[PDB]
Amino acid sequence: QALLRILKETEFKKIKVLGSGAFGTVYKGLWIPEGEKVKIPVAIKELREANKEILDEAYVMASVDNPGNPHVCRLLGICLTSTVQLITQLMPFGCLLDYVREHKDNIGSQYLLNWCVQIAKGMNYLEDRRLVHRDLAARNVLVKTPQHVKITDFGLAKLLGAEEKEYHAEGGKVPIKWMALESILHRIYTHQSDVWSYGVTVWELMTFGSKPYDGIPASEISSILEKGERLPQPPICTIDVYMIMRKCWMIDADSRPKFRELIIEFSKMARDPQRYLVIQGDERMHLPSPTDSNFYRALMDEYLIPQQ
Numbered sequence: 001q002a003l004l005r006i007l008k009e010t011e012f013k014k015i016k017v018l019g020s021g022a023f024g025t026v027y028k029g030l031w032i033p034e035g036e037k038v039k040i041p042v043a044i045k046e047l048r049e050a051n052k053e054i055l056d057e058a059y060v061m062a063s064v065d066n067p068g069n070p071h072v073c074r075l076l077g078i079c080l081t082s083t084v085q086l087i088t089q090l091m092p093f094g095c096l097l098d099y100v101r102e103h104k105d106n107i108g109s110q111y112l113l114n115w116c117v118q119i120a121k122g123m124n125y126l127e128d129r130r131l132v133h134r135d136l137a138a139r140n141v142l143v144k145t146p147q148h149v150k151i152t153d154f155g156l157a158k159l160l161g162a163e164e165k166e167y168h169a170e171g172g173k174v175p176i177k178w179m180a181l182e183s184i185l186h187r188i189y190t191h192q193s194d195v196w197s198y199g200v201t202v203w204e205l206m207t208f209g210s211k212p213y214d215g216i217p218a219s220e221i222s223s224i225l226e227k228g229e230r231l232p233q234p235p236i237c238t239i240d241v242y243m244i245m246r247k248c249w250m251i252d253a254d255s256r257p258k259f260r261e262l263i264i265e266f267s268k269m270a271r272d273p274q275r276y277l278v279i280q281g282d283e284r285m286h287l288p289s290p291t292d293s294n295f296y297r298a299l300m301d302e303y304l305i306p307q308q
């Protein structure tokens with residue numbers, strides 16, 4: 001049962017903007033729950049004003065909060081100020097798209113494959129809750145630590161009813177370059193169209209944050225996919241890794257891998273990481289980990305109106 005803890009704005013202090021974009025505005029803050037002594041670092045999201053959209057996101061997140069999952073962003077509550085704001089635990093390393101672009105020189109094969117495992121685990125949990133995310137992308141994965149990522153942004157997410165296998169969309173803006181062909185052509189979304197987006201997300205990580213189909217207009221994408229063209233092989237990917245991406249982008253949705261299968265295959269690759277990704281100076285790379293004594297030192301348009 002979806003519940004919402006309303007947190008008083010007086011319980012938040014030191015609110016400062018972190019960034020803005022198509023997602024709206026996100027701030028960081030310190031939440032001091034009433035009758036408690038602990039100051040909790042939080043992230044706070046609003047849209048650029050409308051209140052229906054942000055409450056729909058709150059409902060979806062609350063609906064999948066029990067039992068929850070380590071690789072899925074949890075809603076702490078909402079706040080009612082001049083606008084409605086969503087509250088979550090601050091992810092101090094930011095989004096995974098920025099992280100891979102900024103730390104390319106220290107991202108080894110073990111990190112990339114573990115992120116693939118973790119996103120597939122979070123997505124498998126969401127599929128088990130009948131949730132179709134509809135906006136899986138590297139920009140919507142957050143970094144709690146370099147070793148632990150979480151799926152975020154439930155702005156397009158839809159819950160499927162007991163007797164429903166797909167969601168049919170109306171004319172809202174959607175991320176064409178992350179979408180399955182059937183979603184671009186017929187506005188149909190399923191757990192298997194989220195698998196297509198998962199393949200694009202994996203390609204974004206393996207290219208250290210390249211823009212997919214860069215310089216190609218979104219209106220040409222369905223014709224390119226119908227001709228059999230796909231995103232290119234990233235140079236660090238051995239053939240078995242690229243073949244996972246190509247299976248995610250199959251025309252037949254039911255033939256694409258399942259999230260449960262992707263957890264197993266990427267977990268196998270993470271057991272011998274240098275066999276599956278070839279990265280120069282891989283064994284000499286290191287990213288901060290909570291087990292490191294000095295870990296505390298580290299803590300100091302994509303969306304368019306559909307044409308078909």
Ligand SMILES: */C(=C\C(=O)N1CCC[C@]1(C)C#Cc1cnccc1[C@H]1NC2=C(C(=O)NCC2)[C@@H]1Nc1cccc(Cl)c1OC)CN(C)C
Nearest residue numbers: 018019023026043044045086087088090091095139152153
């Ligand atoms: C990503 C950049 C990015 O996200 N950045 C860069 C500067 C900091 C900021 C805005 C952030 C963040 C962040 C940190 N801790 C927790 C959550 C968030 C947050 N970021 C984004 C979220 C999202 O929903 N959409 C995309 C960006 C996200 N989620 C939040 C924030 C507050 C409350 C809730 Cl409940 C919540 O999740 C629903 C790359 N850019 C291209 C987007």
Ligand code: NA
Nearest residue numbers: 022023024155
């Ligand atoms: Na949004």
Ligand code: NA
Nearest residue numbers: 254255256257
């Ligand atoms: Na299959």
